Design an enzyme around this catalytic site. Structure first.
Site, mmCIF file in Angstrom:
data_model
loop_
_atom_site.group_PDB
_atom_site.id
_atom_site.type_symbol
_atom_site.label_atom_id
_atom_site.label_comp_id
_atom_site.label_asym_id
_atom_site.label_seq_id
_atom_site.Cartn_x
_atom_site.Cartn_y
_atom_site.Cartn_z
ATOM 1 N N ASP A 1 -8.410 0.913 4.124
ATOM 2 C CA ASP A 1 -9.091 1.035 3.025
ATOM 3 C C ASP A 1 -10.507 0.415 3.254
ATOM 4 O O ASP A 1 -10.727 -0.429 4.297
ATOM 5 C CB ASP A 1 -8.179 0.342 1.781
ATOM 6 C CG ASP A 1 -6.877 0.985 1.251
ATOM 7 O OD1 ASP A 1 -6.104 0.306 1.356
ATOM 8 O OD2 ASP A 1 -6.962 2.249 1.733
ATOM 9 N N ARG B 1 0.705 -1.231 0.084
ATOM 10 C CA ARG B 1 -0.075 -0.113 0.009
ATOM 11 C C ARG B 1 0.797 1.358 0.198
ATOM 12 O O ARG B 1 0.300 2.239 0.246
ATOM 13 C CB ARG B 1 -1.077 0.194 0.989
ATOM 14 C CG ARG B 1 -1.908 -1.073 1.282
ATOM 15 C CD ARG B 1 -3.112 -1.035 2.462
ATOM 16 N NE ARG B 1 -3.827 0.077 2.141
ATOM 17 C CZ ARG B 1 -3.647 1.180 2.504
ATOM 18 N NH1 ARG B 1 -2.452 1.471 3.657
ATOM 19 N NH2 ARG B 1 -4.290 2.206 2.359
ATOM 20 N N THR C 1 -18.476 3.563 17.924
ATOM 21 C CA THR C 1 -19.528 4.035 18.555
ATOM 22 C C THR C 1 -20.431 3.295 18.772
ATOM 23 O O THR C 1 -20.807 2.929 17.417
ATOM 24 C CB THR C 1 -19.859 5.498 18.126
ATOM 25 O OG1 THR C 1 -18.759 6.427 18.193
ATOM 26 C CG2 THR C 1 -20.951 6.298 18.817
ATOM 27 N N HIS D 1 -7.660 6.998 6.236
ATOM 28 C CA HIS D 1 -7.578 6.224 5.091
ATOM 29 C C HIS D 1 -6.038 5.767 4.770
ATOM 30 O O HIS D 1 -5.807 4.865 4.053
ATOM 31 C CB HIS D 1 -7.891 6.983 3.802
ATOM 32 C CG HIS D 1 -8.538 6.161 2.812
ATOM 33 N ND1 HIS D 1 -8.124 4.959 2.294
ATOM 34 C CD2 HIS D 1 -9.536 6.308 1.797
ATOM 35 C CE1 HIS D 1 -8.619 4.453 1.279
ATOM 36 N NE2 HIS D 1 -9.756 5.434 0.999
#
Lengths: 213, 216, 213
Positions: free
Chosen positions: B195, B16, B170, B191
């Site tokens: 992803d 990545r 949450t 991000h």
């Protein structure tokens, strides 16, 4: 890439744009549960791939109202003549993704040939942007895992970020309907609630009445 | 005391790497998503063994953070790192003042071990009005109790997002829908480290852990 | 505008405020599908224009808990004696909107007289803020085209932005119920999870309890 210029001084949004462009600047997101029952039967009927059919109706909408095609260009508010969709493609092997765009045309069938050609050439290229980006794109992401009731993007830097972002979630059955989570983030300087609203209504309507093709 | 360890991420070997640098610099975004988790089976289990809901659920969340490295990044001394573990920091509400506190408990693979810790922690600190009555450590992920409302959205716009890589969940108010009981559950992630696939797999795996949980 | 200054040092939220002003600063948005079933039966069996009646309930709730009324004034945290609703008025002819405010009053009828004056006097005015902005407002935005399942405001600049922002979506039928999407943005220096849920719980109570006068 042609463009034309907004005359801010003659514009009934002069005040709104100046305020959302400096002090009240904001972006906002909305999620809706779309009724895709009829869209999905058309797509199934025509043996269309879902994702390009759907990027397509979204693209037609961005190419139908100018508020979704703004940008700042060399300091003026401008409206691209067209915008072209930039959608993500997932790579299983590396579990990573790319963003590709495909030239937009009203005719779905003509866009579908562009689309499947770009995916055929670039779908296995692991660059984040296999074919670069252009200035006039709108974003479509697939998030096929989650049937979200909310999807919201918080961009660290929103200055002149006017390009609409859509996120499609994973559809699901509810009684007779198939529903699909759809979010759209837009920047408030260039789009009001009315606009995202008229867009979304036209989307729901087009999805019900497009006959493939 | 436990100090935890960590492993430096070899960025030049990371699939990545390109994403990472885009999302640290220009595309830098965070994002939120909310799901209505189906906790029918989960609930039944909790009621029937005799557990407090909140730590049963935290324990599930913590097993997912501790099964996927994408959730345990930080910048440490100027470098991307994966921690060997992360520990939950959950909220605890004080009635009399109407304030809240944020408590952390050492994670463990075994629910019983975990519960005994949570309970000690909630007994020694449940009443302390400090914000962080046990201070904070360098590797936590967050869980918010939001029991007043059955939200269809919940989401955090942090102002300062730079390396803020630590997941925030949450939890809203469960409620009935036909047969089912469903709980709003929301996650924000950054991000640069996560992803859509990682959050999506995480949630899919949450729904499973909820359903297959035997209760210990 | 009168106000009260907060003695920080005796405030039970001293440390949270301090954390949410400074590094952890954050804002947060929630949406709920309010049950307006009873409320709507009442706005109807009566004289009633929906928007105003709804704006009035949210103004009751803002004016019942000080945490919805803070502001940074000349360097100090303060609580307004009152906050006045600043609502959206749409303009069909130019597809733009303005924000108006109205003086809050406790009694529904007095508020409805003030609202109708303000709307009559200023509703055709194309200014973004036809009456200006005062320093103690909270916002209510009607978004009538979209039964969203989420609405999220992302303000580029959240310093001292303490005024709550509500957004109403389009209401819809489900089962025997009529629901209406309602979102609330607040800033965490001044509002924690408890205050927003207390308020949303009382909003629901008051909608079910409203008598029409």
């Amino acid at each position: 890439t042609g463009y034309t210029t907004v005359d801010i001084s003659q514009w009934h949004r002069k005040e709104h744009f100046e305020a959302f462009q400096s002090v009240a600047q904001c972006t906002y997101n909305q999620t809706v549960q779309l009724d895709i029952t009829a869209f999905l039967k058309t797509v199934k009927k025509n043996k269309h791939k879902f994702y390009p059919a759907f990027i397509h109706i979204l693209a037609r909408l961005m190419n139908a109202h100018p508020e979704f095609r703004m940008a700042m260009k060399d300091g003026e508010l401008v409206i691209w003549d067209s915008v072209h969709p930039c959608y993500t493609v997932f790579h299983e092997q590396t579990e990573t993704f790319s963003s590709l765009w495909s030239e937009y045309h009203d005719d779905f069938r003509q866009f579908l040939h562009i689309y499947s050609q770009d995916v055929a050439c670039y779908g296995e290229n692991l660059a984040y942007f296999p074919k670069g980006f252009i200035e006039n794109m709108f974003f479509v992401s697939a998030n096929p895992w989650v049937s979200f009731t909310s999807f919201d993007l918080n961009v660290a830097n929103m200055d002149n970020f006017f390009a609409p972002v859509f996120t499609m979630g994973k559809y699901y059955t509810q009684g007779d309907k198939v529903l699909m989570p759809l979010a759209i983030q837009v920047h408030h300087a260039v789009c009001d609630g009315f606009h995202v609203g008229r867009m979304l209504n036209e989307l729901q309507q087009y999805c019900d009445e497009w006959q493939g093709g």
